[PDB]
């Protein structure tokens, strides 16, 4: 699956995306 994250994503998954939650700014992981 793919995950919100932050500060970013782990190494070796790809920000593919943003989400915008609780007031800040998300990596979206796959």
Excluded: H, K
Aim: with cysteine; proline share 3%.
């Amino acid at each position: 699956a793919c995950y919100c994250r932050i500060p970013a994503c782990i190494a070796g998954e790809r920000r593919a995306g943003t989400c915008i939650y609780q007031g800040r700014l998300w990596a979206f992981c796959c």
